């Protein structure tokens, strides 16, 4: 039978409440196994189940470093989206990303994921072909355009097809 | 990219001088970088930025300070010029994936 | 980390050119090739993300990605004087950061 891995990064900025809050949670099949919270005293990616404790310190290090970078990405794109939709500045908004991969019984990719939602509504998502994009409204139309131009689809596909699938396996053997 | 313009192209500084290299990009890119190449060889990252307000140290940030006041402006500052900093500085912008470089800024430090 | 084994390479105008590039990088490799003409910044030649392992670039340049051989060698079937320059192989180390190779100087006769 098929298995899956899924990550959910969500950034939420609040009315004059400083920089947005960033969180990232990962799921293998349908169990949370890793998590990161910027609201933490010591922002770090940490194991949510015991079998993940069998990963080296180097693992948790770069995973955490990626998260810190991601925090900035959201911080910036939350702003570019304010523009796109012509909204205020002190306003309260949310921007989230969801990516992942399902694998078939043969352990090879079954479906790739990469998509974004702003303020609760769909924004843009990589289609099942990992080649084309679906753009919710007109603002998203702008992103789609540059992403089609820059070949974003191939960029994400690269990961979805191999790196992801490979790790989903690392984890599936771990427990 | 003709969108990335550095200033100046040639600069000579005296030891101790506070030097500020300026970069401008009309690519509407969030990421901007400052590399240095000094043997026609490998370019090495000094500082980069995820977007306005972001300032991240590279591999050799010592003696350098950076500033991302806005979207299209990223400036590298040598607080106190030292001959170890004479090199060719390149600025780049990118919206994920490909990086686009400026013409370069040749900076020499006379003692 | 990316490695360009040859510091200098010389070819007879009209001949084929091949610049080797090996990469050691655990994560998803995002490889590129930049050319740097005298007194100028690096310019993108070609890049490889996924799909066709053989990518095409500007100026009759192409490269082939080989997960197995861990290479991303560059090639041009017929070089001209114009191609004399320094060629860089680069891998997106942690994206969005880019790590350059030591470069290779190409001299055409």
């Amino acid at each position: 039978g098929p298995h899956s891995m899924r990550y959910y990064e969500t950034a939420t900025s609040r009315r004059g409440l400083g920089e947005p809050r960033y969180t990232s949670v990962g799921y293998v099949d349908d169990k949370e196994f890793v998590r990161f919270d910027s609201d933490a005293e010591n922002p770090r990616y940490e194991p949510q189940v015991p079998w993940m404790e069998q990963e080296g310190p180097e693992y948790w290090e770069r995973i955490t470093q990626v998260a810190k970078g991601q925090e900035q990405w959201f911080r910036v794109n939350l702003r570019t989206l304010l523009g796109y939709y012509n909204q205020s500045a002190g306003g309260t908004h949310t921007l989230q990303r969801m990516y992942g991969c399902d694998v078939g019984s043969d352990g090879r990719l079954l479906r790739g994921y990469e998509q974004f939602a702003y303020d609760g509504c769909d924004y843009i998502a990589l289609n099942e072909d990992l080649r084309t994009w679906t753009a919710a409204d007109m603002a998203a139309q702008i992103t789609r355009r540059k992403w089609e131009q820059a070949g974003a689809a191939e960029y994400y596909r690269a990961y979805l097809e191999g790196e992801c699938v490979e790790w989903l396996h690392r984890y599936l053997k771990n427990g | 990219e003709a969108a990335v313009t550095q200033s100046p192209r040639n600069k000579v500084a005296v030891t101790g001088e506070k030097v500020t290299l300026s970069c401008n990009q009309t690519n509407n890119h969030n990421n901007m970088y400052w590399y240095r190449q000094d043997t026609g060889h490998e370019l090495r990252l000094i500082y980069y930025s995820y977007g306005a307000g972001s300032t991240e140290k590279g591999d050799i940030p010592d003696g350098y300070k950076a500033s991302r006041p806005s979207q299209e402006n990223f400036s590298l500052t040598l607080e106190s010029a030292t001959p170890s900093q004479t090199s060719v500085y390149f600025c780049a912008s990118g919206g994920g994936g490909t990086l686009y470089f400026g013409a370069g800024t040749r900076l020499s430090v006379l003692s | 980390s990316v490695t360009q084994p040859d510091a200098r390479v010389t070819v007879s105008e009209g001949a084929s050119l091949q610049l080797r590039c090996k990469y050691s990088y655990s994560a998803t490799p995002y490889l590129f090739w930049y050319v740097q003409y005298p007194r100028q910044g690096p310019q993108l030649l070609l890049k490889y993300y996924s799909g066709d392992p053989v990518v095409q670039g500007v100026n009759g340049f192409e490269a082939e990605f080989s997960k197995s051989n861990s290479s991303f060698h560059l090639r041009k079937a017929s070089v001209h004087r114009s191609d004399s320059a320094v060629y860089f192989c680069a891998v997106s180390d942690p994206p969005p950061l880019l790590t350059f190779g030591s470069g290779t100087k190409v001299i055409v006769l």
Binding site: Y7, I63, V66, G69, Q70, W73, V76, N77, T80, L81, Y84, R97, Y99, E114, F116, Y123, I124, T143, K146, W147, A150, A152, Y155, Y156, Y159, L160, E163, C164, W167 | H29, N30, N31, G95, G96, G97 | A27, T28, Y30, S92, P94, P95, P96
Partner: peptide, 9 residues
Amino acid sequence: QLSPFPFDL
């Protein structure tokens, strides 16, 4: 390993 840093919106 996670998905790489994403492109600009």
